[PDB]
């Protein structure tokens, strides 16, 4: 009668692996609920900012020739020229800050894309290892049916 009693405690102790697999896929799902959300916000702010950076880039095409010697060419008096440099020097910093913020946002978008790809690979690996936990449970937890089937036949000489 030892052919069935040897695996009695295995059915009781085989809940820990499925519990930790469920916890691992839950942790993967709850990080999955935030990672592409953060990536979508990071790409969406740059998406809203392309329509501003290209507009300020193309804004100098309609007569914004003031970034060098040409700014005195469109000047009529020294009085309107001496105060023009005071706003020209602070305006020339504005698109420099725009290009710096654009490069920073592009680097942040590339980092968010890399993080999203790494998280997708991690979620795929977590799903792949979690599927193997419930793959063999169909024959792991069918031993209780074997125990119930041999419980009736365990009577010696029909009791």
């Amino acid at each position: 009668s030892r052919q069935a009693e040897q695996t009695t405690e295995a059915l009781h102790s085989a809940q820990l692996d499925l519990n930790e697999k469920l916890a691992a896929q839950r942790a993967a799902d709850q990080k999955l609920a935030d990672n592409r959300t953060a990536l979508d916000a990071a790409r969406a702010r740059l998406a809203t900012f392309q329509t501003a950076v290209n507009k300020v880039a193309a804004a100098t095409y309609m007569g914004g020739r003031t970034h060098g010697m040409d700014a005195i060419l469109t000047a009529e008096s020294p009085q309107l020229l001496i105060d023009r440099l005071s706003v020209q020097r602070v305006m020339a910093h504005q698109m420099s800050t725009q290009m710096a913020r654009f490069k920073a946002a592009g680097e942040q978008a590339v980092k968010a894309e890399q993080a999203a790809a790494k998280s997708a690979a991690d979620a795929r690996s977590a799903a792949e290892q979690a599927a193997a936990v419930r793959a063999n449970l169909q024959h792991k937890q069918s031993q209780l049916q074997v125990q119930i089937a041999v419980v009736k036949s365990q009577y010696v000489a029909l009791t």
Binding site: T60, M62, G63, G68, D70
Partner: protein, 295 residues
């Protein structure tokens, strides 16, 4: 026969004359350098017309409902604005331009948007040429307040002054190079006179024993050909060191200002063979045609 017997007397002529000969180097160097500088700055002039508009031109900017959607000028809103400027006798023709042709020309007029700045930003232009560049006070201020026009550009005023100061120094450098060349072409002609003065014995003995007429002025022309090439070499060497040290404080700033065209140190190679042939031609034309009637 062998040309190596011509080399051991031009060196002796340079040994016996160290003051007339280097004045040749400097005097060809200044004229060749000024002519090359004038050619370089007039090449910068007509090279800069590709990024700008000529005097017979105008610029205007349309709205987004015509430039972006229905990019070809086929709607009646585009017709009623395009044909309205031909109701008055001031223009000659218009040009079909749209957002399809907005970024192929954006490279040449702004050397900083070839990177990913953003597509579909430049509006339609439809440039028009007017034969009367004096009614531009009110031609630009006729589209103001009218829908269908975003704004108007008229940059043709006050760029004739920058063209004027750009080509006036070219004309001045051409005049100074010309008058230096007039001062130098007979300096070529008295090289041979002072050489016949200081080498009067052997020219006066080769004609008595009998020499060929070509070989009489061969050792007066071989050193002139190499002196001309040395002069143009010192000229093209010295134009860089005045360009890169004393003059490299404005044109480097004009790249960010996008005023001049793409000008670099390789632009001199397009004119070095013409300058090389010009120097030896202006040497040999006066080194030979003087000595025809002397002997």
């Amino acid at each position: 026969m062998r040309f190596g017997f011509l080399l051991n007397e031009v060196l002796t002529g340079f040994r016996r004359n160290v003051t007339m000969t280097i004045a040749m180097i400097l005097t060809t160097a200044i004229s060749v350098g000024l002519f090359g500088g004038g050619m370089l700055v007039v090449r910068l002039a007509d090279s800069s017309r590709a990024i700008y508009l000529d005097r017979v031109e105008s610029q205007v900017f349309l709205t987004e409902d015509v430039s972006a959607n229905d990019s070809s000028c086929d709607t009646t809103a585009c017709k009623a604005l395009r044909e309205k400027i031909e109701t008055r006798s001031d223009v000659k023709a218009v040009r079909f331009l749209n957002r399809q042709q907005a970024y192929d020309d954006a490279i040449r007029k702004f050397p900083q948007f070839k990177d990913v700045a953003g597509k579909d930003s430049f509006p339609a232009s439809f440039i028009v040429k007017l034969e009367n560049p004096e009614q531009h006070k009110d031609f630009d201020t006729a589209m103001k307040g009218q829908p269908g026009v975003l704004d108007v550009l008229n940059q043709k005023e006050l760029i004739d002054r920058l063209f004027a100061v750009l080509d006036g120094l070219s004309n001045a450098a051409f005049a100074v190079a010309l008058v230096q060349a007039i001062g130098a072409i007979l300096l070529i002609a008295n090289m041979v006179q002072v050489a016949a003065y200081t080498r009067r014995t052997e020219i006066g003995i080769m004609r008595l024993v009998g020499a060929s007429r070509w070989y009489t002025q061969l050792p007066f022309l071989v050193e002139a050909m190499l002196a001309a090439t040395m002069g143009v070499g010192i000229a093209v060497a010295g134009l860089m060191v005045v360009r890169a040290l004393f003059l490299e404080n404005a044109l480097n700033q004009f790249y960010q200002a996008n005023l001049i065209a793409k000008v670099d140190y390789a632009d001199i190679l397009f004119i070095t063979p013409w300058l090389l042939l010009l120097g030896v031609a202006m040497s040999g034309l006066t080194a030979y045609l003087t000595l025809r009637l002397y002997v």
